[PDB]
Amino acid sequence: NFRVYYRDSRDPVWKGPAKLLWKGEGAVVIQDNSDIKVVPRRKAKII
Amino acid sequence: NFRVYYRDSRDPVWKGPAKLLWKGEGAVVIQDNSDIKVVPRRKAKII
Amino acid sequence: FLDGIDKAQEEHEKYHSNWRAMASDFNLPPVVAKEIVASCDKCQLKGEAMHGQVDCSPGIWQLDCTHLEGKVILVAVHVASGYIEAEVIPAETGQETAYFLLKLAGRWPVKTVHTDNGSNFTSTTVKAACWWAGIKQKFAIPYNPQSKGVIESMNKELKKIIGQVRDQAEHLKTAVQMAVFIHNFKRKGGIGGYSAGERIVDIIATDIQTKELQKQITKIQNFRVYYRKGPAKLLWKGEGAVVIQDNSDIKVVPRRKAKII
Amino acid sequence: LDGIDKAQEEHEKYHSNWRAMASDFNLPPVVAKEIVASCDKCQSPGIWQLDCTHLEGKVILVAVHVASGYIEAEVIPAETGQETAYFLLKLAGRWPVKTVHTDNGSNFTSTTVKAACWWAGIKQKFGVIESMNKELKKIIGQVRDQAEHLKTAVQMAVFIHNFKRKGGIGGYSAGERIVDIIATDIQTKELQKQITKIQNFRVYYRWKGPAKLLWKGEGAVVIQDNSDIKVVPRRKAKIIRD
Amino acid sequence: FLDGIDKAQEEHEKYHSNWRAMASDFNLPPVVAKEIVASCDKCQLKGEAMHGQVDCSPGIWQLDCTHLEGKVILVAVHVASGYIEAEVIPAETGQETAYFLLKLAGRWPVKTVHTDNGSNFTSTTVKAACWWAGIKQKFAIPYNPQSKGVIESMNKELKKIIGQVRDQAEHLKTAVQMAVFIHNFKRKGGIGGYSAGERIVDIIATDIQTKELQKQITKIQNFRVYYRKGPAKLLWKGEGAVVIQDNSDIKVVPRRKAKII
Amino acid sequence: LDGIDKAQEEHEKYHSNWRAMASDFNLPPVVAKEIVASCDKCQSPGIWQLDCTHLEGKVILVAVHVASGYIEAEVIPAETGQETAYFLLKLAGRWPVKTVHTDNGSNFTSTTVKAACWWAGIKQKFGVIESMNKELKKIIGQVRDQAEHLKTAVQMAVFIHNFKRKGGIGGYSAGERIVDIIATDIQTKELQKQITKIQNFRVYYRWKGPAKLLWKGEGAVVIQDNSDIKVVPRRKAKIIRD
Amino acid sequence: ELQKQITKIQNFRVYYRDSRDPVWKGPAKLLWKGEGAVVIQDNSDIKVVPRRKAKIIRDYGKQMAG
Amino acid sequence: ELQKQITKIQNFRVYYRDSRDPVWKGPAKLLWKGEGAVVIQDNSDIKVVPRRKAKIIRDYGKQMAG
DNA sequence: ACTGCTAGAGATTTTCCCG
DNA sequence: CGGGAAAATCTCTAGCA
DNA sequence: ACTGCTAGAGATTTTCCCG
DNA sequence: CGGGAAAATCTCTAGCA
Ligand SMILES: Nc1c(C(=O)NCc2ccc(F)cc2F)c(=O)n(O)c2ncc(CCCCCCO)cc12
Ligand SMILES: Nc1c(C(=O)NCc2ccc(F)cc2F)c(=O)n(O)c2ncc(CCCCCCO)cc12
Ligand SMILES: [Mg+2]
Ligand SMILES: [Mg+2]
Ligand SMILES: [Mg+2]
Ligand SMILES: [Mg+2]
Ligand SMILES: [Zn+2]
Ligand SMILES: [Zn+2]
């Protein structure tokens, strides 16, 4: 399992940790409190 | 002699040609209609 | 390190020091200090320093709206070639976008469009137009313009050309069409030293020709290859190497340890 | 290189074009063109034709690519020179348009259309359009019920004609045909460009009389002297400009 | 090329085609097409793709104002080390900036400041403060933040640290001081694996020590070197190479073809 | 390496510190410290002292670096714990401050100052300040006419004291002295860090009894066994952790 | 029959990119074209590239030069 | 006398940059320090660097490690 | 006549360590 | 010398109005 | 489950050209 | 093979809200 810390929508703040559902090249799909988000990998950190 | 085409102050337009008075590393000093300006070399082209 | 580790954890809870500082100030291995930092949610404030790569398939089009002189210009770009289409429209409406897209699909082989999540692109009218034209819709990640970087760059380029020819036209629509013409046929570069129009013609013709050629070849060439495994279909062979497709997994193998029937 | 003699023999026996012989005998297209054009016994993509039609009180401006049957049709507010000039500038920006055929109508002969053609480098000259208009009207009648407005139906008909109607020698569509024809036109223009570059050179080989230059590639230098094509190595030849 | 050149010039006057397009479409040498483009004022719309480098002398300070939570933070950075000073001020006033700068000059050896052209930095009060403190003023090119990139980056960094510790302080000034402390002594990296405070102490002490050492050496070592020329003063010698200063022009020469008296 | 024997002889004859012997005989500082600390016969930078003074009805808070004479003085709105805590947090962020000496005043003993010290890791303990205050007041009197407000005069006096007043053994200023002292403190901390890293190792050489590790450099491995420092090559030694 | 078609397919040039490289690699020679993958040869190196990272042309300037 | 001071000066490390390179070059050995120029030696290569492009330290972590 | 940088997340190359 | 793990160096990006 | 790019200004390396 | 000029390739940046 992984912890993802991200930055979704024009919010300079960073959120997380979220469950990493999917990882691609340049983007990830995560779940943060029953809300699935798609975040570019530029705006995400996976641990 | 050189022709300088530049971009000075928040104006997206490009001006010139101007007389190149001085050239340094990263900046140039030019004269455009008796008005001396200092322009970063990122915003200037010398011919 | 138990004492040093516990001291470093309190020091980080106060100051959020980086792993280098705690390693230097508590005699910690870099792994342990990195673990201390990595377990603090307040320090996870940076993403990985890379970039993705947009789709460049031959049927890929990127659409966007730009604004010039108080008017709206709807711009499409063919990603493979850089060939652009642009039209000045009265408003950023769904019907206007659907009409533009129907025209584009009727003039060129458009298989999918990549747009951001502006209200016009997400309208039901554009969805119906795409359904009728057989176009798939790929929406970018919200507030991520880089996802459509090509069209974004083209926006800049298009505007630049307009700025060069604005005096030659009295309306903005005529200058927009002049800029489209200039970009498509008067600017040369890129992979083939081409213009955008030459490159798009080459891309589309190459797609058709390669499809037909490979169809004929697979019709004639029919073999099964074993390697190291099951009867993988033969794809290509020669020069001591054989490319095969085993269970929809294309792989390259040396000619040694391979048999063709 | 080695296949020039076979290529000339094949041309004498069948009078084939340069593309077939260049494909068959692995010759550069310049040499094949030269041996095709050296026999006196062996001796369109940019032309569009436009017209304005009427349906349901709306004037539809239609341009046809004559070589392929490709159509660009749109509903214009009025049969006016300004709309025609805008349509033609758009078409010139979308496709390589060189000559346009019209019917001496009031719009097509206007000063605005002439100015647009002058800017876009299009030549103006004053039966395919009638058949194409009939087919377009038939398709519009077929797909009228699927659209509320006429412009959308027109665009749907253009889509169907250009990509969903297949026929002819190879069973292709109009879009496929136009892409093929423009690709051939690009090849022809590139070959002409190269001939223009190499026609200003003179080669002295083995020294013998001045000869024209055909190819300067990886293997050797192919020239033509006294209506006879020869191949010589670099050090046995001298290429100059006159 | 006269005919092709004249045709290309008219084609460019209409379309502003790039040199590649005109070379391809009029059979022109790349030099001639590049000359055609280079003589059109309407096509000069791009500068050279480089960057400068800010001054990094030991007496160099970069000052700026940033805004957080509706308050103004005046920030100085020592460019050589990255050591920062910051203070929350009631307003972006010239007297406030002059007071900040007098404090900085009284606490550290400040020889010149590099600021943008904001109204406070260009005030007469700051000029008088710099004159009294013996500080030279270097103003950046207007609307060019990159000229003070260091402090700009520090701004971001400072704000980041504030965002990490904002809950530990009730006022913003206390959180600003906490961030300054953390940056100066709790973050390690850079050239010496240092903190900013350690690095600034090292830089200043090294400057003093090297100055005194070189003064003593030049007091003892006294020679004139001829090479290839006049009596250049000897600066350094050894390993088959001699560095000399001839007419205020420091140059390196091999030990061969050089005589020392 | 080769100079350990000479270094021990020099230390026995003069009882010199490790810095002088490490400079003279080109030894790593760890070995010099070891031979300095192996003889029983041979056996400040972070302390600041603060006080509030008064001038022209304004309370000036002054901190002095005891080792160097460096001063940080500023005019505070009121002699209150909050201003003292803000001043001390600033000073801790500007310099390495470890211990602070105060005079049991109402502000210095407040909970806000204690909390600030706890956050900044400063220890609180309850004659240099009187002389320093006298000198600061003298300088302020000298430069009062050059400033309208008292805070500016205070800062000008701080500037003059820290950089424009030169005296002492070497004729330095207070800023030079404080930078030198903090640089020495950084060196001392680094040496202690390295000793802490290498004190947990045990070396078996030539195998003989366990020995402590001193240096593992480019040449060989320097260890200490039975109060006698030896040098052995790598393959003749084994370094483990206990 | 088959050999002529094979050579015709190898006459096509491919410009491709890798997963983490933003620079388009030079004109490799096309060997096989699939629905989602393309098999190319780049300087005696056989690679398999996703279709989304491949631009397949012919380069008409060059076909007509040899 | 002079030799001790010379070695002491060479004990200082210099991090420098060139005119068009944005990357700081590694810790060269200091040979001479002037008002506006610094003479350094970087891997058997003697260079002259402007003072505005040179950070001269001592690296105390390393002086105290040998 | 002045001038992008900085610090962190990965990726790749160097170096130390024992046989 | 052979790997292998740890350290070091290189690459690259957002945010700084 | 998605994804920075593009075109121009210099700089540096490759290639063609004649001896 | 030796330079030398021309071509080609590589590097890097602003602007795209
Ligand atoms: N735009 C300002 C920025 C700014 O864009 N930053 C972002 C930013 C962007 C790129 C970069 F590489 C570094 C950066 F930081 C900034 O940082 N500061 O500080 C500023 N300060 C003052 C004024 C207005 C000056 C008053 C008019 C003077 C005319 O002469 C503008 C700015
Ligand atoms: N910010 C927009 C930009 C934009 O910042 N460009 C600059 C830009 C910056 C970086 C880059 F790499 C490429 C770029 F181009 C842009 O270009 N376009 O087109 C936009 N279009 C629509 C909306 C708002 C969508 C409505 C809300 C949807 C929420 O789901 C915003 C934008
Ligand atoms: Mg958009
Ligand atoms: Mg956009
Ligand atoms: Mg500013
Ligand atoms: Mg700023
Ligand atoms: Zn933390
Ligand atoms: Zn132009």
Q: Which two tokens stand for residue H2?
A: 């002079």
Report the DSSP pairing between strands H25-33 and F221-224.
unpaired
Rounded CA gap, F33 and F25, in Å? 13
Q: Is the CB of A20 under 7 A from strand K?
A: no
CA distances in angstroms from D209 to D31, D101, D198, D229, F229, listed in the order given = 20, 49, 18, 13, 94
Q: Number of folded domains in chain B?
A: 1
F touches G (3+ CB pairs < 8 Å)?
Answer: no
Q: Which two tokens stand for residue C100?
A: 């533009």
Q: Helix H segments across C54-108?
A: 94-107
At F224, is the secondary structure helix, strand, or coil?
A: strand
Q: Helix H segments across F52-166?
A: 81-94, 111-120, 128-143, 150-159
Rounded CA gap, D180 and D186, in Å? 10
Q: How many CB atoms lie within 10 A of CB F20?
A: 14
At F79, is the secondary structure helix, strand, or coil?
A: coil
Which residues are within 8 A (CB) of C156 and not within 5 positions of it... i.e. 6 or more apart? none
Q: Nearest 5°: phi and psi at C77?
A: -135, 140
Q: How many CB atoms lie within 10 A of CB C194?
A: 26
Q: Which helix (H) or strand (E) holds G35?
A: none
Q: Which two tokens stand for residue C145?
A: 């313009």
Tell me the residue type at C76.
A
Q: Which two tokens stand for residue F87?
A: 């001043």
- Let me know the angle formed at the C-alpha of E253 by E247 and E258, rounded to the nearest 5 degrees: 85
Q: How many CB atoms lie within 10 A of CB C139?
A: 16
Chain C residue at shortest CA distance from A39 = C141
Contact assessment for residue B19 and residue B1, using Cβ atoms and an 8 Å cutoff: yes
User: What are the start-end ranges of the E strands in B1-47?
Assistant: 3-6, 15-23, 27-31, 36-40, 44-46
Smallest Cβ–Cβ distance between A40 and the set C44, C45, C144 belongs to C144
Kindly tell me the burial class for residue D160, based on how many C-beta atoms sit within 10 Å of its own C-beta (0-12, 13-18, 19 or more): middle
At G25, is the secondary structure helix, strand, or coil?
A: strand
Q: How many CB atoms lie within 10 A of CB D125?
A: 9
CA B41 to chain centre: 8
Tell me the residue type at F127.
G
Distance D239 CA to K15 C1' (A): 18
Q: Which helix (H) or strand (E) holds A40?
A: strand A36-40
Rounded CA gap, D52 and G58, in Å? 38
User: What are the start-end ranges of the E strands in chain D?
Assistant: 47-55, 58-65, 71-75, 99-101, 123-125, 166-167, 172-173, 201-205, 211-216, 221-224, 229-232, 237-241
Contact assessment for residue E151 and residue E173, using Cβ atoms and an 8 Å cutoff: no
Identify the CA nearest to H35 among candidates E205, E136, F165, E245: E245
Answer positive or negative: Cα dihedral of D20, D21, D24, D28: negative
- Chain E residues with beta carbon closer than 8 angstroms to that of B38: 141
Torsion of CA D209, D213, D214, D215, to 10 degrees: 110
Q: Cis link prior to D45 (omega < 30° from 0)?
A: no
Torsion of CA D178, D179, D182, D186, to 10 degrees: -170
Contact assessment for residue H16 and residue H62, using Cβ atoms and an 8 Å cutoff: no
Q: How many CB atoms lie within 10 A of CB E215?
A: 10
Kindly tell me the burial class for residue F145, based on how many C-beta atoms sit within 10 Å of its own C-beta (0-12, 13-18, 19 or more): exposed
Kindly tell me the burial class for residue H64, based on how many C-beta atoms sit within 10 Å of its own C-beta (0-12, 13-18, 19 or more): buried
Local structure of residue C194 (DSSP, 8 states): B
Residue E160 CA to ligand 6 center (angstroms) comes to: 15
Question: 3-state secondary structure string, chain E?
Answer: CHHHHHHHHHHHHHHCCCHHHHHHHHCCCHHHHHHHHHCCHHHCCCCCCCCCCCCCCCCEEEEEEEEECCEEEEEEEECCCCCEEEEEECCCCHHHHHHHHHHHHHHCCCCEEEECCCCCCCCHHHHHHHHHHCCEEEECCCCCHHHHHHHHHHHHHHHHHHHHHHHHCCCHHHHHHHHHHHHHHCCCECCCCECHHHHHHHHHHHHHHHHHHHHHHHHHCCCEEEECCCCEEEEEEECCEEEEECCCCEEEEECCCEEEC
CA C163 to chain centre: 28
Rounded CA gap, C96 and C89, in Å? 7
Q: Which two tokens stand for residue D230?
A: 């020869």
Strand partners, C225: C232, C260
Asked whether C240 lines ligand 2 (CB < 6 A), one says: no
Q: Which chains touch H (3 or more CB pairs under 8 A)?
A: E, F
User: What are the start-end ranges of the E strands in chain C?
Assistant: 60-68, 71-78, 84-89, 112-115, 136-139, 224-227, 232-238, 241-245, 250-254, 258-260
Q: Do E213 and H30 touch (CB under 8 A)?
A: no
Report the DSSP pairing between strands C71-78 and C60-68.
antiparallel
Contact assessment for residue D128 and residue D77, using Cβ atoms and an 8 Å cutoff: no
Rounded CA gap, F97 and F44, in Å? 10
Q: Which helix (H) or strand (E) holds F55?
A: strand F47-55
Smallest Cβ–Cβ distance between C220 and the set G1, G27, G57 belongs to G1
CA distances in angstroms from C35 to E52, E113, F196, listed in the order given = 38, 40, 22
CA distances in angstroms from C76 to C54, C81, C96, listed in the order given = 15, 12, 13
CA distance C161 to chain A (A): 31
Strand partners, D226: none
Identify the CA nearest to F59 among candidates F51, F48, F70: F51
Strand partners, D201: D241
Residue nearest to nucleotide J12 (CA to C1'): C49
At G38, is the secondary structure helix, strand, or coil?
A: strand
Domain, as residue range, for B8: 1-47
Q: Which two tokens stand for residue E170?
A: 């009730």
Kindly tell me the burial class for residue E198, based on how many C-beta atoms sit within 10 Å of its own C-beta (0-12, 13-18, 19 or more): buried
CA contacts within 13 A on the Cβ side of F135: 17
User: What are the start-end ranges of the E strands in chain G?
Assistant: 13-16, 25-33, 37-41, 46-50, 54-57
- Let me know the angle formed at the C-alpha of B39 by E120 and E141, rounded to the nearest 5 degrees: 15
Which residues are within 8 A (CB) of E259 and not within 5 positions of it... i.e. 6 or more apart? E225, E226, E227
Q: How was this structure determined?
A: cryo-EM
Identify the CA nearest to C63 among candidates C22, C103, C5: C103
Distance A9 CA to J14 C1' (A): 15
At D220, is the secondary structure helix, strand, or coil?
A: coil
Rounded CA gap, D117 and D92, in Å? 9
List, edge to edge, every strand of the sheet that includes F211-216.
Answer: F229-232, F221-224, F211-216, F201-205, F237-241
Identify the CA nearest to E32 among candidates E16, E15, E42, E20: E20
Q: Which two tokens stand for residue C250?
A: 């294309």
At B46, is the secondary structure helix, strand, or coil?
A: strand
Q: Which helix (H) or strand (E) holds F172?
A: strand F172-173
CA contacts within 13 A on the Cβ side of E176: 23
Which residues are within 8 A (CB) of C238 and not within 5 positions of it... i.e. 6 or more apart? none
Rounded CA gap, A7 and A10, in Å? 8
Q: Which chains touch C (3 or more CB pairs under 8 A)?
A: A, D, E, F, G
Supply the Cα-derived Rg of chain E in whole angstroms.
Answer: 27
CA E188 to chain centre: 22
The count of residues in chain F is 242
Q: Which two tokens stand for residue C57?
A: 């398939």
For the stretch D127-130, contacts whose Cβ atoms lie closer than 8 Å and that sit 24 or more positions apart, written own/partner, are: D128/D49, D128/D64, D128/D66, D129/D49, D129/D50, D129/D51, D129/D62, D129/D64
CA distances in angstroms from F117 to C131, E6, F122, H21, listed in the order given = 69, 81, 5, 45
Contact assessment for residue C83 and residue C155, using Cβ atoms and an 8 Å cutoff: no
Rounded CA gap, D73 and D61, in Å? 6
State the count of interchain CB pairs (< 8 A) between E and H: 85
Identify the CA nearest to E107 among candidates F143, F84, F129, F175: F175
CA H12 to chain centre: 6
CA distance C54 to chain A (A): 9
At D99, is the secondary structure helix, strand, or coil?
A: strand
Tell me the residue type at D61.
L
Q: Nearest 5°: phi and psi at E227?
A: -145, 155
The reply to whether F15 sits in an annotated binding site is yes
Identify the CA nearest to F224 among candidates F15, F34, F29, F21: F34
Local structure of residue D218 (DSSP, 8 states): S
Q: Which two tokens stand for residue E122?
A: 């260009």
Contact assessment for residue F235 and residue F209, using Cβ atoms and an 8 Å cutoff: no
Identify the CA nearest to E202 among candidates D43, H20, C126, H12: H12
Identify the CA nearest to C66 among candidates C94, C88, C85: C88
> Residues of D numbered 188-227 whose beta carbons fall under 8 angstroms of chain G's beta carbons: which are they?
190-191, 194, 215, 217
Q: Cis link prior to A17 (omega < 30° from 0)?
A: yes
Residue with tokens 């030549």: D123
Q: Does the beta carbon of F68 lie under 8 angstroms from any beta carbon of chain E?
A: no
Contact assessment for residue C196 and residue C83, using Cβ atoms and an 8 Å cutoff: yes
Contact assessment for residue H56 and residue H30, using Cβ atoms and an 8 Å cutoff: yes
Residue with tokens 């200090």: C33
3-state helix, strand and coil shares in percent for chain A, rounded to the nearest 5? 5, 55, 40
| CA-based end-to-end distance of chain B | 9
Q: Which two tokens stand for residue C172?
A: 């903005």
Q: Do G56 and C57 touch (CB under 8 A)?
A: no
Q: Which two tokens stand for residue E183?
A: 């940056």
- Nearest ligand 1 atom to the CA of E145 is 13
Contact assessment for residue C158 and residue C179, using Cβ atoms and an 8 Å cutoff: yes
- Output the DSSP codes for D149-195: SHHHHHHHHHHIIIII-EETTTTEEHHHHHHHHHHHHHHHHHHHHHH
Asked whether E146 lines ligand 1 (CB < 6 A), one says: yes
CA contacts within 13 A on the Cβ side of D196: 14
CA distance G50 to chain C (A): 9
Report the DSSP pairing between strands E71-78 and D221-224.
unpaired
> Residues of C numbered 1-60 whose beta carbons fall under 8 angstroms of chain F's beta carbons: which are they?
14, 24, 27
